C-alpha cells in the first residue's frame, strides 16, 4: 500500500479533465428529493462532453 | 560509391598487481644459529644445526 | 570534378536524334564518375510538383559532347572559380545578356525525348530568366484558377500566346500543383481573420491604414492585439481545434512550398564575343553562380 | 582571407579538448584578419529566439586548424560559392548526401565548451537539414505566440517575432485573396471526388472547419474588373512572399553537403565534407 511517491510522479506533467461525470461527487441541499432528478437531469449532458 | 583506407590507433594500459608471501621465525630458538648465547659447550652445537 | 554516363546500345539514327541535345541539364544523383542513362530518366507525363522537389533531392549537370560510347556531363553547384559553360536555352521565350536563370520542369505542353529503342523516356527542365520564372507559374495557376469556377506574355517586342490548356493529353499536369498553392493562400488568410477577428471592420481607409503603419513601428499592438481565442473543447472531442497547431503547421507548409519553388538563381549569361540576345533553340554561354 | 583568432594562454588542460573543435562554426562580428578569443563568445543557453534573431546580424565562420597559439578559421560566405571544406555535425540529426544545412542556435544548453584560463565559455551552435529546421523554427515561433526538451520564452523579444510574422501574414490579403477564399467550398466538392485532391487538404486544415460553418456571397466586382484581373498579381504576392518567409524567421540555407568517396550518411559528432552556396 504504498502509492505517496508514484501518486507524486503523475502530478508532474499536467493532466486535462476530459469528463468528470463518476470522479466528482456534491452535497445537495433539503431539496425535496423528487425535484432533485429533474434539476439533476437538466445538467447530465453538461456533464460528459 | 568507392572507399578510401583506412587507418587506426589503439593504446593498451599496463597494469600492478603484487603476490607476496610471508614466512614466520622463531623466537626461542634464535640463539643456536647465533652466539649471542651460544656456549662452548658441545650440545649448543648440535642444537644448532 | 566531371561525370560521363554509360549508354547503352539504342540504334542507328536515334543516337543522331539525341545528338542534338548538347546543351540541356539532367538531373543526376551522386557524383560519382560512372552513370548509366537507365538512373537519369523520368516519365514524360509526371506530376510537376513531384519532380520539382525531387530537382533539391538532386544535383544538376550539363551534357557536354556525346558518342556513340558514353556521354560526358558537368555538375553546376560544386564549383571552382566558375568555369563558363554552352548551355542551350530551351523555354518559350528568349533571355537577354546580363541576367540569371533558373530551372523549372517543363510546366507548359511538355517536350520529352522519347527513345523507343531503349524503353526509356527523358524530360528536360526549360530555362528562364528570374523574372519571368516568378511569373509564367502565377500565370498558370492563375488561369486554372478562374477555370476551377489573359493568356499574353511580353519579353523582348514579342507577344506570346501561352498554348491553350489541357490541349496536352495530361491536362492533369498541373492540377496538384495549383490545388496546393490556393490551399495554403485559404489557409493564411483565414488564420489571419482568426486571431484578429476586428481586422476587416476597421477603417477601410484609415482604421486599417493606421494598424498597418503603426505595426511596422515599436511594441504599441494595442496591447494584446491579438485577440485570446476561446479556449478549447476537452481535446478528445470530435470538435476540437487548436489555432496555434494549425498555424504551426502553415508556417512549416508554407515554408516548404516557398523552398521547393526554384527562384534561385543558379546561373546567369555571359555571353562574350557573339550576337547580344539569344533565341529559343540556340546554344549561349553562361556561367555558374 | 583566412580569419586569425588568437589564443591567449590555456591551461594544457583545456586546450586538448579545443583540439578536437575542428569543424565547429563561430560567429565573428568584424571581419578583420585578426582577431582575438575574447571577441567571439556567446553567454551560456537560454533565449533561443533572440539567439536565432542574433544569426542573422552576425555572419559565421568555420575553423580549420588548432595551434597552441592561434587558431585559423574561414569566412563563410562573402565572396564564396564553391570553396570546399569540412565541419563536423553537431546536431542530433543525421545529413544525407545532397540536402541543404542550417544554423540553429543549441537545445536545452548543457552543450558549451568551458575555458578556465580565459574565463570565458563558446556556444557551439548545431547544423540541421533544411527541412527540419524549418519546423523547428516554426515550432518556435508558434510557442512564441502563445504568451501574446523546451525552453521557455522571455516575452522581450517574442514579440519581435510575432510582429514580423503578422507582417507578412497581414500583406497577404488583397483583393483578390478574397476572389481566391470565395471557393473554399468550390474547392472542399473537389477535395471529396478524387484521392490526392483530398491527401492535399490535411486534417487539422482549419478552413475544412470553415466550409461547413459559414456561407458567402459572390464577392463584389473590383474597381474597373474589366482592365485588370487581380488573382493573378495575388498570386504572384503569395509565390514571392512563400519564397522568403522562413528566412525572415529561421535561418537561410549556408551550405549543401555532397560526398564522393565515404557513405553518403554521416553519423553525429563525424566530419562530413561540404560545399558553400
Same mark, same amino acid.
Given at each position: 500500500?504504498?502509492?505517496?511517491?508514484?501518486?507524486?510522479?503523475?502530478?508532474?506533467? $499536467?493532466?486535462?479533465?476530459?469528463?468528470?461525470?463518476?470522479?466528482?461527487?456534491?452535497?445537495?441541499? $433539503?431539496?425535496?428529493?423528487?425535484?432533485?432528478?429533474?434539476?439533476?437531469?437538466?445538467?447530465? $449532458?453538461?456533464?460528459?462532453? | 560509391?568507392?572507399?578510401?583506407?583506412?587507418?587506426?590507433?589503439?593504446?593498451?594500459?599496463?597494469?600492478?598487481?603484487?603476490?607476496? /608471501?610471508?614466512?614466520?621465525?622463531?623466537?626461542? /630458538?634464535?640463539?643456536?644459529?647465533?652466539?649471542?648465547?651460544?656456549?662452548?659447550?658441545?650440545?649448543?652445537?648440535?642444537?644448532?644445526? | 570534378?566531371?561525370?560521363?554516363?554509360?549508354?547503352?546500345?539504342?540504334? #542507328?539514327?536515334?543516337?543522331?536524334?539525341?545528338?542534338?541535345?548538347?546543351?540541356?541539364? *539532367?538531373?543526376?544523383?551522386?557524383?560519382?564518375?560512372?552513370?548509366?542513362?537507365?538512373?537519369?530518366?523520368?516519365?514524360?507525363?509526371?506530376? *510537376?510538383?513531384?519532380?520539382?522537389?525531387?530537382?533539391?533531392?538532386?544535383?544538376?549537370?550539363?551534357?557536354?559532347?556525346?558518342? @556513340?560510347?558514353?556521354?560526358?556531363?558537368?555538375?553546376?553547384?560544386?564549383?571552382?572559380?566558375?568555369?563558363?559553360?554552352? +548551355?542551350?536555352?530551351?523555354?518559350?521565350? &528568349?533571355?537577354?545578356?546580363?541576367?540569371?536563370? !533558373?530551372?523549372?520542369?517543363?510546366?507548359?505542353?511538355?517536350?520529352?525525348?522519347?527513345?523507343?529503342?531503349?524503353?526509356?523516356?527523358?524530360?528536360? @527542365?526549360?530555362?528562364? #530568366?528570374?523574372?519571368?520564372?516568378?511569373?509564367?507559374?502565377?500565370?498558370?495557376?492563375?488561369?486554372?484558377?478562374?477555370?476551377?469556377?489573359?493568356?499574353?506574355?511580353?519579353?523582348?517586342?514579342?507577344?506570346?500566346?501561352? #498554348?491553350?490548356?489541357?490541349?496536352?493529353?495530361?491536362?492533369?499536369?498541373?492540377?496538384?500543383?495549383?490545388?496546393?498553392?490556393?490551399? +495554403?493562400?485559404?489557409?493564411?488568410? *483565414?488564420?489571419?481573420?482568426?486571431?484578429?477577428?476586428?481586422?476587416?471592420?476597421?477603417?477601410?481607409?484609415?482604421?486599417?491604414?493606421?494598424?498597418?503603419?503603426?505595426?511596422?513601428?515599436?511594441?504599441?499592438? =494595442?496591447?494584446?492585439?491579438?485577440?485570446? #481565442? @476561446?479556449?478549447?473543447?476537452?481535446? &478528445?472531442?470530435?470538435?476540437?481545434?487548436?489555432?496555434?497547431?494549425?498555424?504551426?503547421?502553415?508556417?512549416?507548409?508554407?515554408?516548404? =512550398?516557398? &523552398?521547393?519553388?526554384?527562384?534561385?538563381?543558379?546561373?546567369? *549569361? !555571359?555571353?562574350?564575343?557573339? @550576337?547580344?540576345?539569344?533565341?529559343?533553340?540556340?546554344?549561349?554561354?553562361?556561367?555558374?553562380?
Amino acid at each position: 500500500l504504498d502509492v505517496d511517491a508514484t501518486l507524486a510522479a503523475l502530478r508532474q506533467e $499536467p493532466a486535462e479533465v476530459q469528463c468528470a461525470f463518476g470522479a466528482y461527487v456534491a452535497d445537495a441541499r $433539503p431539496d425535496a428529493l423528487v425535484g432533485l432528478m429533474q434539476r439533476f437531469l437538466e445538467e447530465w $449532458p453538461g456533464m460528459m462532453p | 560509391p568507392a572507399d578510401q583506407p583506412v587507418h587506426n590507433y589503439m593504446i593498451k594500459r599496463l597494469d600492478r598487481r603484487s603476490l607476496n /608471501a610471508a614466512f614466520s621465525i622463531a623466537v626461542e /630458538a634464535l640463539g643456536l644459529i647465533s652466539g649471542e648465547n651460544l656456549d662452548g659447550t658441545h650440545i649448543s652445537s648440535a642444537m644448532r644445526l | 570534378m566531371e561525370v560521363d554516363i554509360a549508354l547503352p546500345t539504342l540504334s #542507328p539514327g536515334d543516337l543522331s536524334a539525341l545528338q542534338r541535345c548538347e546543351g540541356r541539364v *539532367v538531373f543526376l544523383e551522386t557524383l560519382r564518375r560512372h552513370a548509366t542513362l537507365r538512373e537519369v530518366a523520368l516519365p514524360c507525363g509526371g506530376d *510537376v510538383l513531384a519532380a520539382m522537389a525531387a530537382y533539391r533531392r538532386r544535383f544538376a549537370a550539363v551534357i557536354t559532347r556525346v558518342t @556513340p560510347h558514353r556521354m560526358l556531363a558537368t555538375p553546376l553547384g560544386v564549383g571552382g572559380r566558375g568555369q563558363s559553360l554552352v +548551355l542551350q536555352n530551351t523555354g518559350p521565350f &528568349d533571355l537577354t545578356n546580363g541576367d540569371h536563370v !533558373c530551372l523549372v520542369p517543363p510546366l507548359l505542353g511538355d517536350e520529352c525525348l522519347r527513345l523507343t529503342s531503349a524503353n526509356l523516356e527523358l524530360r528536360f @527542365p526549360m530555362t528562364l #530568366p528570374l523574372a519571368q520564372a516568378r511569373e509564367l507559374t502565377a500565370r498558370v495557376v492563375a488561369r486554372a484558377a478562374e477555370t476551377l469556377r489573359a493568356d499574353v506574355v511580353f519579353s523582348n517586342g514579342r507577344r506570346y500566346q501561352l #498554348p491553350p490548356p489541357h490541349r496536352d493529353n495530361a491536362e492533369a499536369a498541373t492540377r496538384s500543383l495549383v490545388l496546393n498553392m490556393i490551399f +495554403l493562400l485559404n489557409e493564411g488568410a *483565414v488564420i489571419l481573420l482568426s486571431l484578429i477577428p476586428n481586422l476587416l471592420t476597421l477603417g477601410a481607409q484609415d482604421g486599417y491604414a493606421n494598424a498597418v503603419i503603426q505595426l511596422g513601428s515599436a511594441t504599441r499592438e =494595442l496591447g494584446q492585439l491579438v485577440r485570446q #481565442p @476561446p479556449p478549447p473543447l476537452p481535446q &478528445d472531442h470530435a470538435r476540437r481545434f487548436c489555432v496555434f497547431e494549425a498555424l504551426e503547421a502553415w508556417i512549416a507548409s508554407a515554408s516548404r =512550398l516557398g &523552398d521547393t519553388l526554384g527562384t534561385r538563381p543558379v546561373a546567369r *549569361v !555571359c555571353i562574350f564575343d557573339g @550576337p547580344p540576345t539569344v533565341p529559343p533553340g540556340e546554344k549561349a554561354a553562361v556561367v555558374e553562380v
